[PDB]
Paper text:
The KPC-2 β-lactamase is an enzyme that efficiently hydrolyses carbapenems, the most potent β-lactam antibiotics, active against the broadest range of Gram-positive and Gram-negative bacteria of any β-lactam class. Our search identified KPC-59 as containing a single mutation within the α2–β4 loop (glycine to aspartate substitution at position 89 (G89D) compared to the parent KPC-2 enzyme); but kinetic characterizations of KPC-59 are so far unreported. Experimental kinetic, biophysical and structural characterisation of the naturally occurring, but previously biochemically uncharacterised, KPC-2G89D mutant with several antibiotics and inhibitors reveals significant changes in hydrolytic spectrum, specifically reducing activity towards carbapenems without effecting major structural or stability changes.
In both acyl–enzyme structures of KPC-2G89D presented here, the α2–β4 loop forms extra hydrogen bonds, between residues D89 and Q87, that are not observed in equivalent KPC-2 complexes. While the meropenem-derived KPC-2G89D/E166Q acyl–enzyme complex contains a water molecule in the DW position, it is refined at low occupancy (0.58) compared to the structure of the parent KPC-2E166Q : meropenem at similar resolution (occupancy 1.00, PDB 8AKL47). In contrast, in the imipenem-derived KPC-2G89D/E166Q acyl–enzyme complex (a substrate for which, compared to meropenem, KPC-2G89D has an increased catalytic rate), the DW could be refined at full occupancy (1.00) with a lower B-factor. However, the existence of multiple conformations of Glu166 indicates that stable hydrogen bonding between this residue and DW only occurs in a fraction of the imipenem derived acyl–enzyme population. Thus, increased flexibility of the Ω-loop in acyl–enzymes of KPC-2G89D can reduce the stability/occupancy of DW, or reduce stable interactions with Glu166, consequently impairing deacylation.
Numbering used by the authors: 24 to 57, 59 to 252, 254 to 294
Write the structure that this text describes.
Amino acid sequence: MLTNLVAEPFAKLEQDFGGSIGVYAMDTGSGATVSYRAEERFPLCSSFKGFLAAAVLARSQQQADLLDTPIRYGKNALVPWSPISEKYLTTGMTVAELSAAAVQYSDNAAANLLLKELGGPAGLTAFMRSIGDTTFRLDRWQLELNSAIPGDARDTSSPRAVTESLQKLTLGSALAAPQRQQFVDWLKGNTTGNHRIRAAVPADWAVGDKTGTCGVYGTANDYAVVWPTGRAPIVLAVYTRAPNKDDKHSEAVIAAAARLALEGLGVNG
Ligand SMILES: *C(=O)[C@H]([C@@H](C)O)[C@H]1C[C@@H](SCCNC=N)C(C(=O)O)=N1
């Protein structure tokens, strides 16, 4: 009854893109939603790292010393796109610092170290199951998890489940209040999303997000919590893919889909 009260031209947008776009957006005040391909699976790519940091925070509720624990690593941990952890190879970083790097710079070495700590892909999947997400699956470590093969359900979720889980973790009760705010603060400090959902959000609204860019099959994504002033927050996810391995992703398409989602919710920007 409250889903897609106002139609938006998502189909034309994905046709111009040459692929598929999946969108879920939730107005947490009224419960109204915008939904387009929202229950289809799309590759997570690096966007799993946000949920990874939330899983670390959940663990820290029972292990008070976890976040400040210092983690040393060898040069063999430094895989492509490890922009923060490469600067601390000779010193180590704390679990909290690795989590922030994974979220805010999509740092691969940091994500791998944290995934190892949580028991690998199955451990992160188990955390998602524990908050009621039955759709998310992480199956591989990097870098193969980003292969984005058409029809492959490994390392995928749906826009809807991503949004529902993000809501639970940032606004709901899945994390204790201090950890919830820390997760929000990490998302707010993300540096990689300025041309995606944030590009559709007025500068005077708060917003946190996590991006993903698989590098193949036109596959890229972003999810975000947005706090418009004077009304309840909006949670949304925008995922893309495309049929050919060399199809390029588009940041502009993600921003445009986010704009349409906000318009469909009647959120004035
Ligand atoms: C995750 O999705 C990427 C991982 C596979 O390395 C990671 C890398 C950057 S984007 C890499 C190329 N940049 C632009 N096309 C990234 C991100 O910021 O989303 N995540």
